[PDB]
Design a protein around this ligand. Sequence first.
Ligand SMILES: OC[C@H]1O[C@@H](S[C@@H]2O[C@H](CO)[C@H](O)[C@H](n3cc(-c4ccc(F)cc4)nn3)[C@H]2O)[C@H](O)[C@@H](n2cc(-c3ccc(F)cc3)nn2)[C@H]1O
Ligand SMILES: [Cl-]
Length: 137
Amino acid sequence: LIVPYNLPLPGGVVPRMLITILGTVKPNANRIALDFQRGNDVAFHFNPRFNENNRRVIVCNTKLDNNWGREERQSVFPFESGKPFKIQVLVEPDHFKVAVNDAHLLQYNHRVKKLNEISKLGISGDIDLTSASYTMI
Ligand SMILES: OC[C@H]1O[C@@H](S[C@@H]2O[C@H](CO)[C@H](O)[C@H](n3cc(-c4ccc(F)cc4)nn3)[C@H]2O)[C@H](O)[C@@H](n2cc(-c3ccc(F)cc3)nn2)[C@H]1O
Ligand SMILES: [Cl-]
């Protein structure tokens, strides 16, 4: 698939929706981003950074009216330059739950509460994208 890639989420997200993204991190990658959007707002931005001051960190945030909020940072970093990955995002009633390569990574509490209006997922950054899909579990 071509990156950046837009995956419509018809009728928005709902609990029990599972989104699966398969790809490969480019060699010498700098960044990856998943952006769950509600119009121009970003309900959930998931942003692995491969070199922020010589550290690897995952940054999560929300953008409302063109302003970023308080960052939530995770130092557990399961991505590896040059290697294949699987990201699974499970929507639960009170948070997005993220697993990478079948291991739980983080949860992100819903800040945007109109889940039905979060109707697009953008995928960008330094990856080759193989598949992006959803199902109900
Ligand atoms: O909050 C998320 C946003 O962060 C900003 S950078 C943000 O800038 C601030 C000053 O305005 C602070 O400097 C902020 N900070 C917070 C801390 C910090 C330090 C210590 C702590 F303990 C906690 C936080 N140390 N920097 C720093 O993260 C990115 O620009 C923005 N972004 C990324 C992308 C993107 C596009 C395409 C991609 F493929 C991938 C990503 N498109 N927009 C998005 O990620
Ligand atoms: Cl809302």
